[PDB]
Amino acid sequence: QKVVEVAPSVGLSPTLRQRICDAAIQLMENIKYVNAGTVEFLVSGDEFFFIEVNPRVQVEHTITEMVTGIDIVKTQILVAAGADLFGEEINMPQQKDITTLGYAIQCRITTEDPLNDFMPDTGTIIAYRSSGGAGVRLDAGDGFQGAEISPYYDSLLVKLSTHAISFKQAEEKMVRSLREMRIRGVKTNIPFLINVMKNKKFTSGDYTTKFIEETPELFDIQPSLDRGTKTLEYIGNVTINGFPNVEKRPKPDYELASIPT
């Protein structure tokens, strides 16, 4: 289960990544591929292997849009209309000029309770704030200040994605939204993505596929008391049902006491 994606790769060498992208155009050139398509590979040192091929867009296309400035999805729709990718409708820069500018990261915020082995939680969403600002991309899914997520589907509140000149800049900046996020009503997985985001083994950029299993210090102790929620709850109780002791009338008017200091 893919948890977090980076564009482009890191630490992984510049020749290596060259021969892999070469190899990608090989397979697809050879069989005359058409539309968006992910060539999968597996990297063991200066050595890779083919795995499979996803013959459609991916969840993590975001990433590749942000480091090259190509709308993949809009392009799909123009390809299927007949577009030359080097005509005036797509504006594909020829392969030689296509670049990456910096590093981007995606993580999908879901309703998986990491306190309960990532069981999708459901119900109404009754408080919702996303983020925004500098090279922060947001793709809304199921989540809005209104209504509810059902057990039937891939839980995914928000695709959240960040972008900077340096990986470590993008990691900070991804952390900083994850926290601004404010979802209430359904538990979520943010707390676990934060710890992934802020792991030393992450930035160093040399992370294996077993990154996760050999790091127990990712599933970690804090349920969060509902600080101001418990407070709205007290206030709302007293207001409707009175305070047991005290002439249950409206809130009396009070002379403002300037307070010496």
Place this chain on the structure above:
Amino acid sequence: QKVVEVAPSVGLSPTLRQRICDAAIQLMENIKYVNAGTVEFLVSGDEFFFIEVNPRVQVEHTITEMVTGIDIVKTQILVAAGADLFGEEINMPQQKDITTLGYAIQCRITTEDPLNDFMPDTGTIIAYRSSGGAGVRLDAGDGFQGAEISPYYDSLLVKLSTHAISFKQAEEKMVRSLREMRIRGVKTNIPFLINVMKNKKFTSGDYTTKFIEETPELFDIQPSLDRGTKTLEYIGNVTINGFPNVEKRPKPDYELASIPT
């Protein structure tokens, strides 16, 4: 009024902008300049002119961040500490590693009413929805939930910037995004903004600061039949003040025998 900002310049040839930069840099390193700074030129043919310096950030710094991938306001702060530009901290590329990948546009969403002399509107916001997705950047201003905006400050609700490899593509991105926004309870400048975006003579790139003045039809603004809003006004009205000839009873649709078809 700076109304719409673009980066970089569509209308300048390579060697002009290269000289337009060089000049600015000439000024700034000649007098020791430190931190963020903007040098303004007026441009007629193949000749710049120096106009002013802005010794800080400007609203439209985001547009530069989008195409250089360098966080301007971040660095400001790093610089104030004492960090170096090309050191671990700021990770600024050397002058000839810096580039534009793509083009970005900035729009500032205000409550300035176009039909009424660009005069800031006042009051509570009764509906607020924004944007997101490919190429969209949003910097929160005054708008949310149910802010009252006051007549005391520059009304700026959202800063909206978009980003793609083609300039046209950034435009048609802007217009998507503008058309998505819902701000309710105040007038805004969205339609005027839509109306500059759509304009051939802005898409052409070749535009002068005489643009808005010699394009009168920017002000041609039809309000469309916003069904949704109107229907809520009607239901609200009847719910509270009832119907003419009709007595206030418990609301029918009271046979679950639906309708033969």
Place this chain on the structure above:
Amino acid sequence: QIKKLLVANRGEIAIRIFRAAAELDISTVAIYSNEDKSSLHRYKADESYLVGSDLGPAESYLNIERIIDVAKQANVDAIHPGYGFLSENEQFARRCAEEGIKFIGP
């Protein structure tokens, strides 16, 4: 040459495609199951149709022929399968063709 586009999918990616489609001045049709009654994505498209009265879980997004039903009934020139349902279904791809609906993909 695409005037009207349908998305055989739900959630972020239907939304992603709808935004993409608008950028291109193409009308959009969405589709939803029952329990997707109040999904964001259903509200983000120019047009929206229930996929059949009777279908439950995911079965509602995997029904090749009924999605085509909606597709034909609404004058659609192309379908974007998105990812995760019929995105990778030969049947769907093939049947789209036979009916003059452009399958977006390979």
